Design a binder for this molecule. Structure first.
Ligand SMILES: C=C(O[C@@H]1C=C(C(=O)O)C=C[C@H]1O)C(=O)O
Ligand SMILES: N[C@@H](Cc1c[nH]c2ccccc12)C(=O)O
Ligand SMILES: N[C@@H](Cc1c[nH]c2ccccc12)C(=O)O
Ligand SMILES: [Mg+2]
Ligand SMILES: [Mg+2]
Ligand SMILES: [Mg+2]
Lengths: 665, 632
């Protein structure tokens, strides 16, 4: 779907220039309607956004618009007023407007701004043409300024409650810059507002929130608040970097409204274990079941929380769920194809601000002891902060040995010779017996490799010990999407200067840049299938990030979901991660199936949370140990392209194992 | 309407990226279709263009683009700037994944990066335009849309066109005097100034041919009158632009390939300002002249000033010998006898003080100084009340003269050589234009160009003051703002008839100097939507924004009140509509209208916030100077 944009026309003064820019920016032309039109007769319904073109036109028609102003001002739809006059401003905004110190018509102004809403991503200053020599100083308390001119007057504003915006310039004038970006921004605002439109069904839950101004050691929170045995989760920002990673999340299945949930690809059945102990087996595809439950259990985000996870499902998506995306069911995993804890109670650590947030659900109209838990857990955390404030290994066994792996790379190099793939992510699977238990082994791992997306899942069937640095999908409740595919890996150096050498090498090597580039294109394709035209872009390209085990080459891709596209639907379209398959995904996954001679399981999948607000945050499962039956499984791999040497790419798989192997030792 | 594009998904990791780029470039998302879907069912008719990602495809009649059908490799791509590479720099960067045809581009590897089918509308790019490592991706996709627009426009003639080249170029005035009768209806489209890139051709002809006609229009009654060769005059109550559109479609004739211009005969004449009544204006005032006047020229003489030859154009009925061939032979004989040795001094009467003397001895304006000064003040008041941003206020001057058209025109063209000069000698009036201004130049292919002039400076009485005034015009904030607002206005007009993403401004605030004045000039280009005729384009842009002010519709209501009368031929458009669908129109400024023993000429100027009254009055007198001089 797409937004239906209504463009109000005033004597066709500038209407068709606005037409052009909206069309180019959004890929969808607006519907043009005169300012004399009957708004009651007109189906304002369907129209998701309104743009009000300026005059001057007829004195009569302008007066008629004013008589019927409330059709637009109190309609509830996003509105953008484009450089309106004294009367146009009084009608739509209701403010006072005088003559400007530099009162030229068609004046070229420099506009400085806060970078908010319609001004998102614009440089400050930027050039813009002002037609009306009318501009405000005093604003009513209901109106907030967003931007100002070089002659000290308001160039942009918004109403603090209603989705109304005003620009006191012409974005679409030839003498203006970033006109198309301003119209795309307004389109994006319209998508957010439409997504926030609840209606639907009454929320079955009642979220309760308490902040606690203490921050204990996260492992101590694991030991202090969670059970020694039982099904738990710990989303672990073991590395904390401003703008990169900030929060940790812990919880268990002890709560009354908690559920444990699993899927098998062979069966196609969801298993939901409630608090009763009773497990229920309904049959429908996983992403399909997940969407319905996320829609059913929808809870508004609590704006007091600085994070988006307002409780929901926490777990992993296995690689074999590809069978329900664009892949084939070639190999059955030894582990569940998905597994999530539906968390009704959770501890959130704010590593930035040095406080905790406690989330708990009651059923609507019921007291299930949420507030009792909040009060109780707060007391525990307070006491806890006082005690503790904040090759493959000797017995390891690769699925493919060196000789077998080299032959499989050769196969990959023939595949790329024949044009059947542009890049194959060939991965291996290593198994080793261990006497270690989950928490001690994870304690070792997180010390070795602090990362933004660390995780310890302790489930009945398995334990997942992730030291992933890689962001698969961060999806806002507003429907904004970000993916940061990694491809291009360098081992750390011995000395400081050796490090800087490998840093420089990774960023500048043609080979690596091509690997990354092709994945960026692939991820862009996936996002475009579910995102609005004009929304997909690449803010950063070929950035090197450094972590304890490796240097990594990372690119950032953003987009905004189409209207009616759920978060689950977005994840389906992008799963499995392009960074873990290759280009083109489908054909490259067929090749993966044949060559790997076995399943990946949780490796190469996604691990994270789906929230009841609609938000989500998912990592790629790399640098991860799966713990089950005294066995330790970990997957490793690397990009195969036409330039690829075999032995270097095998050695790469060994290097990516350092963390997991060091921890198991 | 809009174009309908088809994107064939060949099941690679590119379809949805291409989908984005097409959406942004054209303002319309493509209809995505899988490859395995049956073409038997597909409504190929309903679509206008095909894009193919890495059988019936090529043999569908439709334009096609094949996208890349060693790895991940970035390459610099050098090209000839043709078709899909239109306007792209050479080199430019492109990511690439992977006979009889014509190669268009090459990589730094020496591999073909672009190809073309020589007959079929089939293009190939051996790179990914939509890749993140590529540049000018959206431009390539926009170009393809433009190629597809044109291809469809190029899709029975009641006439057959006959052409003859003569390898002489006599003096153009000698052609007028030597080849055309003198009395009777004639046209002379006069490139009195020839400058490469600016003007190249002149066109002359009369009504003596057997298939020639003479059209007039009155908006008062809304009646078109057409005079045939036999003497009979048909009369019809309707709007002119619909009439024009119908006739041009009906009388379609394709462009002759060995002609270096696109006028292959058609209509030559003028559109009066009062035709605004059937565009976006009101019928507030009735002109004393026909609101439109055109000769359907079945026989014409074209001068190629660049190459030093003539072209003779003659229309026969598709099945008949109507003496066209005989006319070519006779006219060619006449022309060779006129070819003798070429014969100028620029007239220095355009220096500031003296140029603003007056309207002549025997002249009176509609509004005298005090009257005009008040209408400026009025203009300013409405500008303060935000009822206009810019108003092109104009006057009209009438002066008795006994001068005949051709001797007067001969004096005028000597005084003020221009790219868009014209002598129209019609039954009801003569029009003596020394216009430099391009209103609309429309190709057969549907490419559109407008060059609004706004921002005027007089010539310096000294050469130093002249070069001062020139640099002042290019730099002054006031004049740039005046010009810019017209550019936005003309952009707005054209966007109503052009495809989304096709309208752009390749040049802004260019100073052009002519004998009487320095002028600030901007260029706007676009490309017609499918279904939109050449006539439809003109209606949407008429009258020229350069002659109205911004915003157009409201400002045209204001000028009705203040001017208290018609403009007539002045402030309208003059030029040709070709049978190929091409057109070339000037704004009627710097023009004498001659009728009934008196000369009429209009003069005006833009009024804005900072317009000085005395100066804006002086401007209008300065602009009359060429006309006043010729009449003296
Ligand atoms: C009104 C006339 O000229 C118009 C006014 C101009 C100006 O104000 O600078 C320049 C270009 C013309 O569109 C005229 O020449 O009569
Ligand atoms: N880094 C996330 C939280 C987080 C840590 N590990 C994770 C694993 C999966 C998903 C999220 C996480 C944040 O700062 O908000
Ligand atoms: N200058 C134009 C022809 C031309 C001269 N005077 C004109 C008046 C109106 C329209 C066109 C013309 C050319 O070079 O082709
Ligand atoms: Mg710009
Ligand atoms: Mg680029
Ligand atoms: Mg002026």
């Amino acid at each position: 779907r797409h937004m239906r944009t209504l463009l109000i026309d005033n004597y066709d003064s500038f209407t068709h220039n606005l037409f052009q820019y909206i069309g180019e920016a959004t890929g969808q032309p607006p519907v043009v309607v005169p300012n004399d039109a009957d708004w009651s007769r007109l189906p304002v319904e369907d129209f998701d956004a309104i743009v009000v073109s300026p005059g001057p036109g007829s004195p009569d028609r302008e007066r008629d618009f004013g008589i019927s102003r409330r059709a637009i001002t109190d309609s509830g739809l996003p509105v953008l007023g484009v450089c309106l006059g004294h009367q146009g401003i009084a009608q739509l905004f209701g403010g006072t407007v005088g003559l400007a110190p530099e009162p030229m018509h068609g004046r070229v102004s420099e506009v400085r701004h806060t970078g908010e809403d319609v001004f998102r991503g614009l440089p400050s200053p930027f050039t813009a043409v002002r037609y009306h020599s009318l501009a405000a100083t005093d604003l009513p308390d209901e109106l907030e300024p967003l931007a100002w001119s070089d002659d000290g007057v308001v160039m942009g504003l918004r109403h603090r409650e209603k989705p109304l915006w005003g620009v006191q310039f012409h974005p679409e004038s030839i003498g203006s810059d970033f006109g198309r970006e301003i119209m795309a921004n307004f389109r994006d605002l319209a998508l957010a507002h439409h997504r926030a439109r609840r209606h639907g069904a009454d929320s079955p839950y009642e979220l309760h929130v308490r902040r606690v101004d203490v921050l204990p050691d996260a492992e101590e929170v694991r030991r202090g608040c969670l059970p020694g045995e039982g099904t738990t989760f710990w989303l672990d920002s073991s590395s904390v970097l401003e703008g990169a990673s900030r929060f940790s999340f812990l919880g268990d299945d002890r709560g009354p409204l908690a559920e444990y949930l699993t899927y098998r690809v062979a069966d196609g059945v969801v298993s939901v274990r409630g608090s009763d102990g009773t497990t229920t087996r309904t049959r429908r595809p996983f992403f399909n079941y997940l969407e319905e439950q996320l829609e059913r259990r929808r809870v508004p985000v609590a704006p007091e929380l600085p994070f988006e996870f307002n409780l929901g499902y926490v777990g992993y998506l296995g690689y074999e769920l590809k069978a329900e995306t664009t892949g084939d069911p070639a190999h059955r995993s030894p582990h569940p194809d998905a597994a999530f804890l539906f968390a009704d109670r959770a501890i959130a650590l704010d590593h930035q601000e040095g406080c905790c947030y406690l989330l708990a659900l009651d059923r609507r109209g019921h007291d299930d002891g949420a507030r009792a838990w909040l009060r109780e857990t707060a007391e525990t955390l307070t006491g806890l902060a006082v005690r503790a404030p904040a090759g493959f290994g000797p017995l390891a066994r690769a699925r493919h040995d060196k000789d077998a792996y080299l032959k499989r790379i050769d196969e990959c190099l023939k595949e790329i010779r024949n044009g059947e793939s542009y890049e194959i992510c060939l991965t291996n699977m290593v198994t080793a017996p261990t006497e270690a238990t989950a928490l001690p082994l994870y304690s070792a791992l997180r010390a070795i490799s602090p990362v933004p997306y660390g995780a310890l899942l302790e489930f009945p069937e398995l334990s997942v010990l992730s030291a992933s640095p890689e962001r698969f999908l961060t999806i806002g409740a507003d429907g904004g999407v970000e993916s940061k595919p990694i491809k291009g890996t360098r081992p750390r150096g011995g000395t400081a200067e050796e490090d800087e050498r490998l840093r420089a090498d990774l960023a500048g090597r043609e080979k690596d840049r091509a690997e990354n580039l092709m994945i960026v294109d692939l991820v862009r394709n996936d996002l475009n299938s579910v995102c609005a035209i004009g929304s997909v872009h690449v803010p950063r390209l070929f950035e090197v990030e450094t972590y304890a085990p490796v240097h990594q080459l990372v690119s950032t891709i953003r987009g905004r979901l189409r209207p009616g596209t759920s978060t689950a639907a977005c994840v389906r379209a992008a799963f499995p991660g392009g960074s873990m398959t290759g280009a083109p995904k489908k054909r490259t996954m067929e090749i993966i199936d044949r060559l790997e001679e076995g399943p990946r399981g949780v490796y190469s999948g996604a691990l994270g949370w789906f929230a009841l607000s609609g938000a989500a945050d998912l990592s790629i499962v790399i640098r991860t140990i799966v713990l089950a039956d005294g066995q330790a499984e970990f997957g490793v791999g690397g990009a195969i392209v036409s330039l690829s040497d075999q032995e270097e790419e095998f050695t790469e798989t060994v290097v990516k194992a350092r963390a997991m192997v060091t921890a198991l030792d």
